[PDB]
């Protein structure tokens, strides 16, 4: 499925090139701009543990999820990954624990050393 495609075909968007965050663009967005650190970003998403049937989704807020990019308001992989998206883009991200919750996890919801998968839509972003 979608995680396997990211493993085989996903681009490594980490600075260290350690495959900690792999990306596939699933729908191309508009324009050339991608958000800067400090910008307020608005997304829809769904997220899964790799090994589990439990899903989280912004569609249940029925509302955009909002955060300021590069301000440690989300896991590292999202500061890295969302920064690469254009407005209207939908991407898949496969995320190793070092760029999420690490060996600690976030118990009981997130286990130790969990890989995560997300589908993310960048709705909009605005300068601070
Ligand atoms: C800088 O590092 C951190 C910053 C923030 C956190 C908290 C979890 C942080 O979660 C995350 O960063 C990632 C990426 C964004 C979407 C949520 N997310 C998650 O892992 C999800 C998540 C994790 C959560 O807590 C761990 C959630 O809160 C209970 C949560 O609620 C909607 C959702 C996982 C859920 C299970 C399946 C795998 C996904 C979070 C959760 C909810 C809203 C957030 O920002 C917007 C807002 O506050 O309105 C930020 C952990 C961090 O490190 C582990």
Numbering used by the authors: 13 to 140
Recite the paper's sentences:
Here we used the FK506-binding protein 51 (FKBP51) as a model system to evaluate whether chemically engineered proteins can be trapped in pharmacologically relevant conformations. FKBP51 has emerged as a promising drug target for chronic pain, obesity, and depression. The major challenge in FKBP51 drug development is selectivity toward its closest homologue FKBP52, as the binding pockets of both proteins are very similar, but the biological functions are opposite. Selectivity for FKBP51 can be achieved by targeting a transient conformation characterized by an outward flip of phenylalanine 67 (F67in and F67out).41−45 This conformation is rarely populated in the apo-state of FKBP51,46 but enables high selectivity vs FKBP52.47,48 To stabilize the transient binding pocket of FKBP51 (F67-out), we aimed to lock this conformation precisely by the formation of an intramolecular amide bond (sites displayed in Figure 1B).
Two positions, K58 and K60, were identified as promising anchor points for lactamization to the residue in position 67. This was expected to trap residue 67 in an out-like conformation and stabilize the β2-β3a-loop by a seven (i, i+7) or nine (i, i+9) amino acid macrocycle. Furthermore, for position 60, the size of the macrocycle was finetuned by incorporating ornithine (Orn) or diaminobutyric acid (Dab) as smaller lysine analogues. Protein crystallography of the ligand-bound proteins confirmed the desired 3D structure of the synthesized and refolded proteins FKBP5116–140 F67E/K58 (i, i+9) and F67E/K60Orn (i, i+7). The protein fold, the ligand binding mode, and the conformation of the β3-strand were identical to recombinant FKBP51. Notably, the side chains of F67E/K58 and F67K60 were well resolved, which unambiguously confirmed the desired lactam bridge and its F67-out mimicking conformation. In contrast, for the lactam-bridged variants, fragments resulting from cleavage between F67E/K58, F67E/K60Orn, and F67E/K60Dab are undetectable because the covalent bond formed protects the protein from fragmentation at these sites. Lactamization within the protein was expected to shift the conformational equilibrium toward the F67-out-like conformation. This should result in a higher binding affinity of conformation-specific ligands, as the energetic penalty to adopt the F67-out-like conformation is reduced. When lysine is replaced by the smaller ornithine, up to 39-fold improvement is achieved.
